[PDB]
Symmetry: D2
Subunit: 248 residues, 4 copies
């Protein structure tokens, strides 16, 4: 099975790529930093003995995205699983202080990118035989309830839910499944913004609990392990003790 | 670890119970049909080789649920996992023709039982040591979007979403996690091969695609396997090509 | 036009009944206490010069609900609007201390009543010429996000959302429109000035910002002003500054 | 009271502007077509006797957006109400056939414009005295449930839900309220059903949408319609597709 994980050189993406590789998949990963990507491909293929190709790619750029998918096709002929994971955040700055440059950055990375990757996945999954495949979109807890000072991130994540639905709907008759995982506070280490301090509903900065990245990878492996006729349309996996379920 | 699965003698409940047993849990299942319950317990018990107990119990009855929980406490002293699976649908009938008996019946089976068991899980989990546990509510995609002639069913399943939400909020400080699985057309092979017709949005009757019960049991196993600090707040697992994600 | 407002002798329901009457509806309000209900009807009819009829009734009781609707048919021969407003919020107690009596009462008040009335509205609205009419369900902010120690109320209000969806679906072909209003901290000037403490997400007690009942009343008048072919499917009207939209 | 309606020259926006102008608001409308915009402002103004200004302005352009709000501040010194109504759709072409231009254009129209106007509204409303004001976001039924071949539209409208929540949250302590209206089949023949078939659907007069917006804005800042869905009753939505 062929898998493509955008933003798979670092963090959650990497742990997903790693777990996917251990399960047998051939895995392509994308990122913008060749050293990081090269490194991760080497370590993961290292451990698993299975194929790991690294393509440097800006998913906001349509030519680069188109090139990425033409390379994947040229080497593997088909694509069985796409994990749309590339993203980014804005500093928690006041809403009216977000620069145009920051705004464009997050729309491209968090929404446009996931959209261009879906298009190319559709074109490949429709054409290949057997037809079909799965697309899993990395969402966020921000697809449900915002932190203060997070309009852009919160918009782009909400937009991903929309994308997931339309994709789930348009792909139905084509044996293409689409599902979304909303992630709550997954972190490799205390270097992450959750341990470093994130805004609470009252506008204060505080540290929040996190969950090992390993659990998310596990979850995604389960979503992808399903036959095309089953689908995890949405799932929320989170640090249990982080604020979310109460009023803020 | 000790697990309790209501309505675990049949269907989704049985598959969940079996999977949990194969995972090494000591499993306790409930139901109203003694033969069927024993049979189930015996079979699972055999294949896995672990303690699978069967208690005949009407989870809509406070006295029975009390006994149910007193039994569990007396044998195992603790409870790590409660799966609220007991529940039943209803043959569709025009909204105004639903009898009081039917309404009351479907409220007790789909809501009250799950509430009563949650109550007792909480009391056990808050008092046991180590303290804490996980509660998984079986909801339904009717918690999202109804079939025609299903007000009572749709209401109780929406009500489960709220129950999960409150249980999750109230349990947060006690290491008690709760999450909901919304299932879309899971069926045993025999039941699915029946091609039972169901009401579409336009009122027509037609059979729908289904998925194996195993995939739901795998998902519940995953949910349950996380440490207490992690939680699947919700997840929709479904037959990919059944109607739902588009407009009805 | 004929309108029926359950629990319309007091609070939000009384305010709605007042505004509808002011709009030239004939209004039937229901409630458990005769003196209260009678006074309200007379007070309202006074200001507007329109018929306000007070029926002392427990909408959780099937027989009573039947007499109620029979009394409505016998006098006005039609029903054009049903506002399911009767309900109640238990004073907050730990999840596991909620008595069976409390549970049955809140489920009967907050969900059963609305269903039974909706059943009879259907009956009448399908029979009359020309057919149709509107149903407005009083949901809650708790249909979205719970306060701590409120699983029963949160569950019954979530349930109303299910009810509304199925009602809207089933009524479609009969020119019956269903919509729901989720109210956030609406209060009488009397009740509001008391500064009553309520539970926050963290378990602290504090008074919260409120809004005049008059605004909910105005909202319902708008919902009902639409021809049957248009519908406010849902609206949330709330105190702008009360906690809700951020994480708790 | 000073109101600003983006895309107020035509369709739903123009209805909202008309209704607001009738309630006694001074109104500013925006659009890219000066001829249409000028004429709509004249029609409305002549009907109500109230000030209606037309600013030619593409909301996806941060300079034009800044210049627009500077003109509002210049004449009125304040803004009480922003209605983010501007927006567009993309032909029901299959998902992989949508062009990059079509994508960029709907993103700019439906999400970026709303965000940019929101920014400037915040700046003004936090500075003016009395401070605060209200922002009403025109969302869509597509923020709940998609038609086939509508990923870009469905995503951007879902994004509006995110924007609304964050605005409501960040605005709370500055006497800024923000709510969203999801419209179903405003009249402005056949559209795509869940099964891919083309069929026509019930609609609702612009007049009822405008009424709903007028209701939302009639509230004092301490009250807010956080979201509402106003729709043609008998259109598919609440059932499975």
């Amino acid at each position: 099975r062929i898998a493509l994980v955008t933003g798979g050189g670092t963090g959650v993406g990497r742990g997903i790529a790693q777990a996917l590789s251990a399960e047998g998949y051939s895995v392509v990963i994308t990122g913008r930093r060749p050293d990081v990507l090269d490194a991760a491909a080497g370590e993961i293929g290292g451990r698993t003995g299975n194929i790991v190709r690294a393509v440097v790619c800006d998913v906001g750029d349509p030519d680069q995205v188109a090139a990425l998918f033409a390379a994947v096709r040229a080497e593997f002929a088909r694509l069985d699983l796409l994990v749309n994971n590339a993203g980014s955040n804005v500093p928690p700055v006041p809403l009216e202080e977000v620069t145009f440059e920051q705004w464009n950055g997050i729309v491209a990375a968090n929404l446009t990118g996931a959209f261009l990757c879906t298009q190319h996945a559709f074109r490949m999954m429709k054409a290949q035989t057997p037809r079909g495949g799965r697309i899993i979109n990395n969402g966020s807890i921000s697809a449900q309830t915002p932190r203060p000072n997070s309009a852009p991130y919160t918009a782009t994540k909400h937009a991903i839910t929309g994308l997931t639905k339309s994709t789930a709907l348009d792909g139905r008759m084509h044996d293409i499944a689409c599902g979304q995982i909303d992630i709550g506070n997954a972190a490799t280490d205390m270097t992450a913004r959750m341990s470093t301090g994130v805004l609470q509903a009252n506008g204060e900065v505080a540290a929040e609990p996190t969950i090992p990245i390993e659990h998310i990878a596990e979850a995604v492996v389960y979503m992808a392990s399903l036959p095309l006729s089953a689908n995890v349309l949405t799932m929320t996996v989170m640090a249990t003790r982080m604020p979310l379920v109460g009023r803020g």
